[model samples]
Target: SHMVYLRYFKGLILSDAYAPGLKWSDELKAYSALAFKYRDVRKYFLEKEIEVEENVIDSLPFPLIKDKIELRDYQAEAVKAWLKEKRGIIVLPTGAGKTQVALKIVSIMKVATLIVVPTIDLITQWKERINKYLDFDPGIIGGGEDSLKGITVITYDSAYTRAEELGNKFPLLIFDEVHHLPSEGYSIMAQLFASPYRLGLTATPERDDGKHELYPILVGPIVYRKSVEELAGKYIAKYKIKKLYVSLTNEEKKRYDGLRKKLKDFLSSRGLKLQNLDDFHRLVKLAAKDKEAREALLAWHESLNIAVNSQSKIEKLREILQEYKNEKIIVFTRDTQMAYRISKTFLIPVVTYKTDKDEREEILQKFRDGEYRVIVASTVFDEGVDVPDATLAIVMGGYGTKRQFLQRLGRILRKKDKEALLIEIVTKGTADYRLSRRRRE
Candidate 1:
């Protein structure tokens, strides 16, 4: 029973940190290590010369071909900061070449890499850049297409489901939009990987849920950060947020107030403190069987719809279109239904997750060519994909999360001739007005 060994079981690393370890496994009757600690475990065994009989990954080769790409000054510094530890999240504002930083790191590390992203949009975008820069057709794991080559890009949702089976495949794991990594269950994917090196990239690392505090443990701490105000006017566009308040018509206000009256009475009578999203979620659970609570919540949502999709805001939207007709405009809606409604009413192209890559490219491409002067996009951008070549953007509804607001505003924040402007249409005297303030906070 004095035999020492190390092995990979599913996504866990077994018994290299026998001397100093954190977990005990009943199956092996020995100390175990989470896959993330693979390096530290082996380091102790090697430095102390307390050798293991068999280390499944001890001599595994991680291949990387060194390639060069011209990087901006900030991008180069960002890459350098990351290489020192080869772990940590880089917080650069959106449109600040966060992908370029990752690509540069990939080329330098050049090992078999799995760049984990949140959306399928990024899967294709990352694949294109890999081909454009590295000239290799990387693999795809989402969209129901299972392809495998070196440098495969997978969605975070897909990664965790298959983390155990595929944990040992890559040496470097680059989590794009790394803020999403510390989310509800996806952090497990980070823990399951035995990869010694990790690089997390994000435009904003803070989540309203406070899960971002886990980033240091999941990936790494913030290595370098350049804020929106840091490089604007020279590197990126100088941006200003404009808030436009639209009032509901008299007839609309009656419906909105009547609905709110019932919702307000129910809350006050029940002594419910619905202060945050969590509280609202609890109320949602309470409504499952409670008839009055159910109807009250229904009233609440109906009022919100009236506020979000009010006629005056549409009238204001029409005015904004007429005012900014000479400029290329990108509009953001809170929901896909609104996205479709606005697209239909205004006769503009809309982009959403339902859109295929070919048509999305054509829409964006033609918009860039100045043939189509405006485009409407839905809340899917909350997942944070790249939106290029726009300096003017308008929001159809309020955004609660600061990151969501910034991600939406980031559409036109790239450096341009005129300053980047983000216009928010807030329904005055409603929760939309209150929620809109969170963006600046």
Candidate 2:
């Protein structure tokens, strides 16, 4: 057998067996576990019988920091699992030190690294944490900045757009919130990058669209997984989830029933059913072409609003707020309008997509500092941002997904000696009840 060499290009591994008639049958068979396409170099590595040069990788200057962070026992074990595989996803719930595990891997690999995240806030947070532990200034690729360093953090959108340009730059790719990578527009970022080493971190690995199966091919399979139940109280804070079912007022129920009837009749006429997201999207597309469909869609939206923001739910929320007036609380709603209502009625700060970055930071700071006892928000506070010292979360309404529930539950699960409570307000006898049940399932 002759010597074989490997190099990466355009997602393919080019190899040279150092022979004119060198067949890859025997050599490739031995290395079959390596899941990359083999191609010929068509060049002189064969004549010299040398390993293929990975010239694409440059010497990364990682100034290892002297300040050490002691990893939890599970964190060290998770890192070991990834190191043994060299590529795979680590499924750890939010606040479970998935970032700590990834940082440890970076200390070991010491290679040029690219961390892709879903939000601009996460890019900033990750860079801060990386700078704290590692002795280097991590670069920013998103949030109105386009900087590249040995270790860089890029948002998923920015990384997708710059995929080809940044393909060969990093050998180690860490995907924060790996579930987002399997979407149509974002999946190409994985395909275009030449990074052989990948670590995907996600609290929720499964996707409703079932595209999560791509993780095995894109970033390797699940090498390590620690559930919320597994890590709760040990690594994260001890917590309890409480579900409160509320009834709609008579007037609200009348309006809800009327709107639901209209929407149901339209759907029945069109032979449409709301079973999954795809079915809902089909209805939306149909609404684009048909007037009746548009009315039905509008009615459905109104009905959901009536159900989600019922006067009874608000009354229950008030009771909850009064009961926990002294505790720092986060009120989560499904829509910005609902969040705004809660913010105005309760006089609490609200954060949403419309909120300015600086304002959001101020609100979070106040919440952390105990200046504000309650903060109301929409999906903006669902994931990725850090809000500490909060032990109570009041979820008013949200979509039925385990990921959404877990992310909201995680907001109050930051490590603390005290127990945390996540109170979910459910509207009984409406679609909201089904959503809550489905999300739990």
lDDT (CA) for every model shown?
0.78, 0.74
- CA shift at 276, candidate 1, in angstroms? 60
- Over the stretch 294-335, how does candidate 2's per-residue lDDT look in tens digits? 999999888878877777777788888888875877777767
- What range of 10 consecutive residues in model 2 has the weakest lDDT sum? 31-40
- For every model shown, what is its TM-score relative to the native structure? 0.51, 0.45
Candidate 1 RMSD to the real structure: 21.7
TM-score of 2: 0.45
lDDT of 2 at 218: 78
lDDT of 1: 0.78
